Amino acid sequence: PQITLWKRPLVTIKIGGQLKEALLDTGADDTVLEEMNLPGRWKPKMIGGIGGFIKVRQYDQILIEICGHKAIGTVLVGPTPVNIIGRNLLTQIGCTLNF
Amino acid sequence: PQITLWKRPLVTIKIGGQLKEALLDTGADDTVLEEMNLPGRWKPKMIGGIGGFIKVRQYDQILIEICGHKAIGTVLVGPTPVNIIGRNLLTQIGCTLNF
Numbered sequence: 001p002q003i004t005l006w007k008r009p010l011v012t013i014k015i016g017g018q019l020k021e022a023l024l025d026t027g028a029d030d031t032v033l034e035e036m037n038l039p040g041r042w043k044p045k046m047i048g049g050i051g052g053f054i055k056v057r058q059y060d061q062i063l064i065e066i067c068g069h070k071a072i073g074t075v076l077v078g079p080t081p082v083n084i085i086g087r088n089l090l091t092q093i094g095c096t097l098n099f
Numbered sequence: 100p101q102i103t104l105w106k107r108p109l110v111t112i113k114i115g116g117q118l119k120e121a122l123l124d125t126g127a128d129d130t131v132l133e134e135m136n137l138p139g140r141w142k143p144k145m146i147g148g149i150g151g152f153i154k155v156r157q158y159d160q161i162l163i164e165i166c167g168h169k170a171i172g173t174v175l176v177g178p179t180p181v182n183i184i185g186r187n188l189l190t191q192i193g194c195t196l197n198f
């Protein structure tokens with residue numbers, strides 16, 4: 001749906017058979033999730049933000065249902081304060097900014 | 100305009116008679132800009148993100164023209180890796196997420 005920004009643009013996501021809330025973040029190039037058991041192989045990685053940097057596990061080809069729209073892509077898992085859906089996954093469900 | 104997310108949603112802003120490029124970030128509640136000389140009084144403040152926290156100068160009632168749309172609101176100035184337009188100003192120009 002079309003979402004106003006008077007509140008945080010949070011949506012319900014399905015990933016690894018698990019129900020979570022994530023932030024539709026146009027300022028994030030990648031998707032980062034709080035710690036979870038995501039199945040498959042991974043490769044260490046590091047991502048930076050306003051506060052500095054955090055170490056994450058990079059998992060490629062992960063299925064994620066975002067508000068009912070399906071997408072497959074890289075999902076990073078690490079000590080993020082919040083689950084953020086980045087542009088890597090937003091492009092797959094056809095999200096756009098409109099003003 | 101309508102903006103797709105295959106590339107970073109960067110836009111041109113005018114603040115303090117000075118031209119800059121900023122990221123339209125629906126994941127940011129407020130606006131933070133890299134170091135610049137903005138006129139007036141300010142108030143120290145702590146803001147947190149991925150990696151931790153940074154100290155910034157808070158400027159209230161600041162005018163910003165974002166891609167031709169004018170808005171007035173609080174602008175934080177500090178060691179951000181990139182200029183971010185947060186939800187405080189995105190709502191002023193009528194931005195929405197659509198999918």
Ligand SMILES: CC(C)CN(C[C@@H](O)[C@H](Cc1ccccc1)NC(=O)O[C@H]1CO[C@H]2OCC[C@H]21)S(=O)(=O)c1ccc2c(c1)CC[C@H]2O
Binds near residue numbers: 026028048
């Ligand atoms: C985490 C999120 C909940 C909030 N952040 C917004 C998020 O969009 C940021 C933006 C950014 C930041 C730095 C560099 C480049 C982009 N991206 C992000 O960390 O993304 C990461 C994963 O992808 C990677 O690519 C980009 C970076 C990597 S914030 O900036 O920490 C923030 C927090 C509190 C406040 C504000 C801002 C305004 C004042 C207060 O309201």
